[PDB]
């Protein structure tokens, strides 16, 4: 039969960057990432993923695919 249910097929995986500049946002189900600034919300700066309450109030993870790609100077060993 239909072996289909209507599942939506993605590729995403992990945007991983730091916090550079500001842009402001108006959906619940994410939060706005800001510029270096003074703020509450744990940003992740070799990640693009964050979760707090920014200078807004509002508080939402995103890939602040807004910002400066960050690269993991150092390394790891096996």
């Given at each position: 039969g239909a072996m289909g249910s209507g599942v939506i097929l993605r590729q995403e995986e992990a945007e991983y960057v730091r916090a550079l500049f500001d842009f402001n946002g108006n959906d619940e189900e994410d939060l706005p990432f800001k510029k270096?600034?003074?703020?509450?919300i744990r940003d992740k700066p070799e990640e693009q993923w964050w979760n707090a309450e920014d200078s807004e109030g509002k508080r939402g993870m995103i890939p602040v695919p807004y910002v400066e790609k960050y690269r993991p100077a150092s390394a790891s060993v096996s």
């Amino acid at each position: 039969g239909a072996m289909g249910s209507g599942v939506i097929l993605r590729q995403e995986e992990a945007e991983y960057v730091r916090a550079l500049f500001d842009f402001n946002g108006n959906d619940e189900e994410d939060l706005p990432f800001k510029k270096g600034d003074i703020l509450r919300i744990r940003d992740k700066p070799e990640e693009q993923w964050w979760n707090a309450e920014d200078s807004e109030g509002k508080r939402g993870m995103i890939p602040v695919p807004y910002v400066e790609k960050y690269r993991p100077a150092s390394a790891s060993v096996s």
